[PDB]
Design a protein around this ligand. Structure first.
Ligand SMILES: [Mg+2]
Ligand SMILES: [Mg+2]
Ligand SMILES: [Mg+2]
Ligand SMILES: [Mg+2]
Ligand SMILES: [Mg+2]
Ligand SMILES: [Mg+2]
Ligand SMILES: [Mg+2]
Ligand SMILES: [Mg+2]
Ligand SMILES: [Mg+2]
Lengths: 240, 225, 52, 63
RNA sequence: CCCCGCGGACGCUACGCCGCGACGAGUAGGAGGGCCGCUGCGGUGAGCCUUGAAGCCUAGGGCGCGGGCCCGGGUGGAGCCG
RNA sequence: GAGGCCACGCGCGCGUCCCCCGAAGAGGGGGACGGCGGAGCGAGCGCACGGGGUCGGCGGCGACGUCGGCU
RNA sequence: CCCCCCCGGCAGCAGCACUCGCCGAAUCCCGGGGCCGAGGGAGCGAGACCCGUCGCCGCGCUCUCCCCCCUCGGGGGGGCC
């Protein structure tokens, strides 16, 4: 075997390489790389033991089904696309760059102005309008439901902790093991608890974002306020 | 004989793959040659007109030999002679299109159906847009979309037409086998003209849409499909 | 649709890839030339105005 | 709307025997298979004759 | 010479099932299909029924393009349907 | 002689053309093209504008008050 | 101000100083909104066995060897006659 190489055919447009068939033939040196000519055990033998039980037993793995349904469904055709969500390419709007002030449009933090940090692996934005300013913790949000404003702070050379991932922010549930019929109320644990780790992470990020917020005048007052539509103003005439 | 039959199937499969590979290289090179031919024709008309103007003369181009005919009126209240000619042009529906080879016999047919059609002289782009987007073949009396080259080759390969490019070359440059290649194409089912028409009930030269617009048929085609 | 789907067009017309590749390469070369030609004109305009 | 005429769309022909003879229907089944799965035009002619009425299947004298 | 595996979906009431393409106005009139409907006869359902038939009623649940049909509830009181 | 393109890439022998000496302009030595000549085989990973949609993505809410029922 | 010059020179050029066209084998790239997802056994191969990531088409790497630039083995490039 040999070490893998880069593509040697730069892309210039999606689906079209920069070099032709003969150009890539010479780049690959295909003139000298010419080739003409030169498992899993389903059953296992196990010593059964015991006198006059024979020697061993040819025990097979994956025994045949005990039961068959009265009728089945035919298998699907093949689609040559339709990747799973984890393999989708994640797209981010050009107006959303790290440090941009965003406006939340949905949720309990509706209308608040927060600070954008990074896009996560699922494409959800990680924001923290710092908790001391407008009570928005380190929290995920969707880029489709935010407004990217023009004002930005340079949050370069700040250290977002690496464990802050999609798995970190994914919701946790309790119900429902060891319980089938509800005769005693299972309303306990409905109080979500803020982990000490989440408080530590909130303090760590905000300790290095807050000094940069105070660097420009009355930005903290801007972040403390909420966005609203006055009767005179129209969102299509507003420069954000 | 299990080993020998495997070798037979491998040799047969490899022979078929080489034949497909050779036929793809022929198709690639014919399109390269057609591209050379198209630009030679385009430059030649420019060159001929330039040498005429240099000498103070006039270069009259060849009269166009290909027309694209679009039926623009419906099927209600049509006189029997106009009704017959539209059927002979394969235009039995409104906004149907068909390439027509121009000569004395065909032009005099176009004069009869003049209030009912809009036609003109398609350029190379218009032919490509029509065949690629809306090209359907009449294969076994069925309207089959031209999604694979093997559909053209099985019906027109005896005439040398084996690909989309060959079909376009035969339509554009009206070849020996234009009748077979044109009749192979199902008449084009175009949409309504986006942006509207001017006036379908009068002639083009009097502010309407009927009749022969010379090369403005390409403007119509872009809006039509 | 061909003319919208690249691989469908390449299935029908394999030469469409080299025409498209040549067009993209040519248009980038022409665009670079017009950019550099215009910058030289502005540079000459600046030089002929601030020549001292 | 399309300018066509629909009076000749349906071709009038026997697609099967009008008879309910089960022995005739069995050998129609046999010759329906042989017409489909062979290139013999003989089997095609015999199949369509099996569909025909008695007046379209006149007797053949020995002479 | 298949065999560490002894194994491998569905289908084809052929009067069935499957694929592709085009098409769909309609009086008088013609034709086809009707697992639309009514009554009676020969067969058949080891059919249904006083632990409730027919009929009727119903802001009950549905099916069919439709003709119509099935089921629930009530009333009824001896027959009825595929 | 201080760039660009090619859907050009095994040998041997045969042909066609070009080059050298050409000691009969003989006879050999070299390039290019070939659609010519009796003899088997590439595999191994991937990416996808590729014979009609999937997620190996997720959230909230649920018993005497609400959930669904286009009829 | 107009015309003819003995003749023009420079830039730009159907102009990103929005005066007046026809076009694209002389045409490509990218983005946004809307509606839709019909179909369902595509395996000549192992003699399939986890639900055929399959055909046509377009590509990349390896079964050759050197380097170059970042990470700390991984990633990105030049090729190699
Ligand atoms: Mg009228
Ligand atoms: Mg409009
Ligand atoms: Mg009129
Ligand atoms: Mg219609
Ligand atoms: Mg009719
Ligand atoms: Mg009708
Ligand atoms: Mg009537
Ligand atoms: Mg221009
Ligand atoms: Mg589906």
């Amino acid at each position: 075997k040999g070490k893998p190489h880069c593509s040697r055919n730069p892309v210039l447009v999606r689906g079209i390489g920069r070099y032709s068939r003969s150009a890539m033939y010479s780049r690959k040196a295909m003139y000298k790389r010419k080739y003409s000519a030169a498992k899993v055990l389903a059953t296992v033998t196990k010593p059964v033991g015991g006198d006059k039980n024979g020697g061993t037993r040819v025990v097979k793995l994956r025994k045949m089904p005990r039961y068959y349904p009265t009728e089945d469904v035919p298998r699907k055709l093949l689609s040559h696309g339709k990747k799973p969500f984890s393999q989708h390419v994640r797209k981010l709007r050009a107006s959303i760059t790290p440090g941009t002030i965003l406006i939340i449009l949905t949720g309990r933090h509706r209308g608040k102005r927060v600070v954008f940090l990074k896009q996560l692996a699922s494409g959800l934005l990680l924001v923290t309008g710092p908790l001391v300013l407008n009570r928005v913790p380190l929290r995920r949000t969707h880029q489709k439901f935010v407004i990217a404003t023009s004002t930005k702070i340079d949050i370069s050379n700040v250290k977002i902790p690496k464990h802050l991932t999609d798995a970190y922010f994914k919701k946790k549930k309790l119900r429902k093991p060891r319980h089938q019929e509800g005769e005693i109320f299972d309303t306990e644990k409905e109080k979500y608890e803020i982990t000490e780790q989440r408080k530590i992470d909130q303090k760590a990020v905000d300790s290095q974002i807050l000094p940069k917020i105070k660097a420009i005048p009355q930005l903290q007052g801007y972040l403390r306020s909420v966005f609203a539509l006055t009767n005179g103003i129209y969102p299509h005439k507003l420069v954000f | 004989n299990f080993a020998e039959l495997k070798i037979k199937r491998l040799r047969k499969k490899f022979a078929q793959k080489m034949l497909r590979k050779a036929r793809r290289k022929l198709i690639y090179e014919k399109a390269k040659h057609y591209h050379k031919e198209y630009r030679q024709m385009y430059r030649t008309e420019i060159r001929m007109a330039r040498m005429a103007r240099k000498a103070g003369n006039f270069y009259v181009p060849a009269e166009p030999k290909l027309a694209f005919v679009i039926r623009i009126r419906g099927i209600n209240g049509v006189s029997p002679k106009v009704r017959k000619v539209l059927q002979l042009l394969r235009l039995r529906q409104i906004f149907n299109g068909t390439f027509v080879k121009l000569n004395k016999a065909s032009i005099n047919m176009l004069r009869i159906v003049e209030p009912y059609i809009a036609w003109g002289y398609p350029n190379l782009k218009s032919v490509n847009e029509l065949i690629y987007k809306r090209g359907y073949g009449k294969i076994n009396k069925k309207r089959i979309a031209l999604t694979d080259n093997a559909l053209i080759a099985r019906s027109l390969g005896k005439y040398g037409i084996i690909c989309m490019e060959d079909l376009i070359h035969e339509i554009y440059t009206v070849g020996k086998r234009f009748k077979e290649a044109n009749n192979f194409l199902w008449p084009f089912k175009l949409s309504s003209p986006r942006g509207g028409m001017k006036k379908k009930t009068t002639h083009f030269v009097e502010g309407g849409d009927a009749g022969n617009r010379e090369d403005q048929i390409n403007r119509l085609i872009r809006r039509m499909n | 649709n061909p003319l919208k789907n690249l691989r469908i067009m390449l299935k029908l017309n394999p030469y469409a890839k080299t025409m498209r590749r040549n067009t993209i390469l040519r248009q980038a070369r022409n665009h670079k030339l017009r950019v550099d030609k215009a910058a030289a004109a502005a540079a000459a305009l600046q030089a002929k105005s601030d020549e001292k | 709307g399309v300018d066509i005429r629909h009076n000749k769309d349906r071709k009038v022909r026997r697609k099967e025997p009008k008879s309910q003879d089960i022995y005739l229907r069995l050998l129609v089944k046999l010759y329906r298979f042989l017409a489909r799965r062979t290139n013999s035009t003989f089997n095609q002619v015999v199949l369509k004759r099996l569909f025909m009425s008695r007046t379209n299947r006149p007797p053949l004298s020995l002479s």
